[PDB]
């Protein structure tokens, strides 16, 4: 256009998708333990319990 | 008698191309669902700012138009005829008779008798339609031809009109007439006015549809949103003063 | 980037305002009765 510029976002879409996938994997595997420090694995049934 | 001009009388307002934008234009157009005349085949009619004109027959009985202010001598006038294929345009004085026409007996004469100081010359079922607009010294002509099957009935359809010619004069025109070809022993007239329209173009700069804003509340609702489709809801359009 | 130069393009040259029949006419007129031929829509070449 006439002087209008659209900057590209710093985080590209696949990078955000990778963040979301990592969050899903952590939630499924370690429950809420990975949100406070090192991820601690636990069976999913016991996490739901 | 009378008939109703359904959705006809739309012309390209300029030489501009658009791909898919719905462009809103403020110009002179024939209002949608307007009242027009039912001439049979004829008298003289006024020439306020704009006029519409449509003809429909399988036999070429309609030929040319006569324009001017007084339609006599001493006043400049415009003349268009077509004998068989030679389109002739003259912008100059003439002396028209009380019954100007051209028969197809089989004689073909008796339109006028005058020629002096003439400022321009040029030599070149179905539906025919023309729009005549005289502004700021120029004379605009638009045309379109669409095959049909109705005998002498105005059809139901939409078609844009493309500019044909333009000539500079700078004169004032008030009245006009028409010629015919019956024997020697079927046209419409519409009136233009300032309105507001939005047009549709489909990737080829062709007008495929239009909506008259001042017709009904739905039309002005579409005009405000600038779209041919409206979703459920309530919209503010104008004020009651 | 800066434009290299300016370019102008216009349509072809139409009817040429036939001055050739006014400057090379076979016989002009006497001064008390002079012609008044007028020109109209066309392109006039005053350079020539």
């Amino acid at each position: 256009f006439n002087g209008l510029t659209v900057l590209p976002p710093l985080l590209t879409d696949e990078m955000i998708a990778q963040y979301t996938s990592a969050l899903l994997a952590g939630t499924i595997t370690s429950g809420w333990t990975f949100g406070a420090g090192a991820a601690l694995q636990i069976p999913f049934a016991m996490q739901m319990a | 008698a009378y008939t109703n001009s359904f959705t006809r009388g739309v012309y390209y307002p300029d030489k501009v191309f658009r791909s898919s934008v719905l462009h809103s234009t403020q110009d002179l157009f024939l209002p949608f669902f307007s009242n027009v005349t039912w001439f049979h085949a004829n008298p003289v009619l006024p020439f306020n700012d704009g006029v519409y004109f449509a003809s429909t027959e399988k036999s070429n009985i309609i030929r040319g138009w006569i324009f001017g202010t007084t339609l006599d001598s001493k006043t400049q006038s415009l003349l268009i005829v077509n004998n068989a294929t030679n389109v002739v345009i003259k912008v100059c004085e003439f002396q028209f008779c009380n019954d100007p026409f051209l028969g197809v007996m089989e004689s073909e004469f008796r339109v006028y008798s005058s020629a002096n100081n003439c400022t321009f010359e040029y030599v070149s079922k179905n539906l025919r339609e023309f729009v005549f607009k005289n502004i700021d010294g120029y004379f605009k002509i638009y045309s379109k031809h669409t095959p049909i099957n109705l005998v002498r009935d105005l059809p139901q359809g939409f078609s844009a009109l493309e500019p044909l010619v333009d000539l500079p004069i700078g004169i004032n025109i008030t009245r006009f007439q028409t010629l015919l070809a019956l024997h020697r022993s079927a046209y419409y007239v519409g009136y233009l006015q300032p309105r507001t329209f939005l047009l549709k173009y489909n990737e080829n700069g062709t007008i495929t549809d239009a909506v008259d804003c001042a017709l009904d509340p739905l039309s002005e609702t579409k005009c405000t949103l600038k779209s041919f489709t409206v979703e459920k809801g309530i919209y503010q359009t104008s004020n009651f003063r | 980037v800066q434009p290299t130069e300016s370019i102008v393009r216009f349509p072809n040259i139409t009817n040429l305002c036939p001055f050739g029949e006014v400057f090379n006419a076979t016989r002009f007129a006497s001064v008390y009765a002079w012609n008044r031929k007028r020109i109209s829509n066309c392109v006039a070449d005053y350079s020539v």
Binding site: - | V16, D136 | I7, V8, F10, V43, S47
Partner: protein, 98 residues
């Protein structure tokens, strides 16, 4: 004997055209419209009464040259900001430019 009548002007001299140039940054002018940009052929279709194209945002984007009757498209010449990447003068004086 010339004159200026209230009627529109009809007779006057020939406009001097020049050669068109493609794929460069120039200052075009066709029959009054004027600007700058890059001239290139466009795969579009016009109508015999249609001079130039205008897209969304009401910008002149396509024009047909009145010599070959073929459609050309116009795009603005390259414009953009300049950014400087530096590690800090306290560390080094090398500079990267974007």
């Amino acid at each position: 004997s010339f004159e200026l009548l209230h009627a529109p002007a009809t007779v006057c001299g020939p406009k001097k055209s020049t050669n068109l140039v493609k794929n460069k940054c120039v200052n075009f002018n066709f029959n009054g419209l004027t600007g700058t940009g890059v001239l290139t052929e466009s795969n579009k279709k016009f109508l015999p009464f249609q001079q130039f194209g205008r897209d969304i945002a009401d910008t002149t984007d396509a024009v047909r040259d009145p010599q070959t009757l073929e459609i050309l498209d116009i795009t603005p010449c390259s414009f953009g900001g300049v950014s400087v990447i530096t590690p800090g003068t306290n560390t080094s004086n090398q500079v990267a430019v974007l």
